[PDB]
Amino acid sequence: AFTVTVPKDLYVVEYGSNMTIECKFPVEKQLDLAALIVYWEMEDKNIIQFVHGEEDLKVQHSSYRQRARLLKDQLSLGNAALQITDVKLQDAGVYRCMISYGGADYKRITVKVNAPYAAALEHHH
Amino acid sequence: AFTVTVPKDLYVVEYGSNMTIECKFPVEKQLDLAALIVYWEMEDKNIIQFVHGEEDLKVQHSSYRQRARLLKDQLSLGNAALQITDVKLQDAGVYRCMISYGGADYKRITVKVNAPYAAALEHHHH
Ligand SMILES: COc1cc(CN[C@@H](CO)C(=O)O)nc(Nc2cccc(-c3ccccc3)c2C)n1
């Protein structure tokens, strides 16, 4: 059936860097964008909502606005790729990509963020 | 748009009893049973996978085998109802109902499990 595949289940990124996380779905010939549904979330916090042919930024979290973008060019090739710029300590956790394209499946990705003492002290408050 | 509806966000059930948790999805005409996908989960642990008309328990956690079943009759009016037999202290947590039927949505449900001392002390060890 329809199964989403993740090439890498764990990402290790440095503080302030940019990370692009990848999950893949099977594409037959072209993209019926009127049926593609991509939901990117981490810890019950929406990052990006792809419904119809565009993004639904009505539920995107503020912490991920101006930092999160799904590579629309890669959706043709069946790669729902989410990019987060300036990864911070709070971007560590379990991410979930849910894709609906005829079928439906989801896969989880765990992100670990290394950081220097200064940035870590900031998270400790 | 397509929205999943939960009549109850919190369940309070007794140890050893039977519990049925309900999430609801809108059906206008009939079932595209080739397009209905129902995922019942608890804390990144699959409970039930309803794809193409039947259940695919191939990813079901061992803790739920022989106890979890999706009520196929309630699918008539958009009721994806999950029943757990022998609710245990380990069955407490955040459940997730994920449905794809002409769109996609999911909602979370929290289950609290009361239990007598004997079952709790036994669960507190091992
Ligand atoms: C939390 O909100 C939203 C919103 C949306 C879409 N946005 C609109 C659509 O109409 C809205 O429903 O609001 N999809 C999602 N999850 C999602 C996305 C894709 C597939 C699946 C899925 C379904 C069955 C099995 C496995 C995965 C799921 C759960 N979650």
From Swiss-Prot, chain A:
The lineage of its organism: Eukaryota, Metazoa, Chordata, Craniata, Vertebrata. This is Programmed cell death 1 ligand 1. It comes from the Eukaryota. One of its GO terms (molecular function) is receptor ligand activity. Keywords: Adaptive immunity, Cell membrane, Disulfide bond, Endosome, Glycoprotein, Immunity, Immunoglobulin domain, Membrane, Nucleus, Receptor, Repeat, Secreted, Signal, Transmembrane, Transmembrane helix, Ubl conjugation. GO terms for cellular component: actin cytoskeleton; early endosome membrane; external side of plasma membrane; extracellular exosome; nucleoplasm; plasma membrane; recycling endosome membrane. It is linked to Truncation of the 3'-untranslated (3'-UTR) region of CD274 transcripts leads to elevated expression of CD274 in multiple cancers including T-cell leukemia, diffuse large B-cell lymphoma and stomach adenocarcinoma. Disruption of 3'-UTR region is caused by structural variants that stabilize CD274 transcripts, leading to overexpression. Increased expression in tumors promotes immune evasion and tumor cell growth by allowing malignant cells to escape destruction by the immune system. It comes from Homo sapiens (Human). Induction: Up-regulated on T- and B-cells, dendritic cells, keratinocytes and monocytes after LPS and IFNG activation. Up-regulated in B-cells activated by surface Ig cross-linking. The chain holds residues 18 to 134 of 290 of the full protein. The keyword Repeat applies. It is found in: Cell membrane; Early endosome membrane; Recycling endosome membrane; Nucleus. The keyword Protein biosynthesis does not apply. Plays a critical role in induction and maintenance of immune tolerance to self. As a ligand for the inhibitory receptor PDCD1/PD-1, modulates the activation threshold of T-cells and limits T-cell effector response. Through a yet unknown activating receptor, may costimulate T-cell subsets that predominantly produce interleukin-10 (IL10). Can also act as a transcription coactivator: in response to hypoxia, translocates into the nucleus via its interaction with phosphorylated STAT3 and promotes transcription of GSDMC, leading to pyroptosis. Glycans are attached at N18. Belongs to the immunoglobulin superfamily. BTN/MOG family. Residues 2-110 form the Ig-like V-type domain.
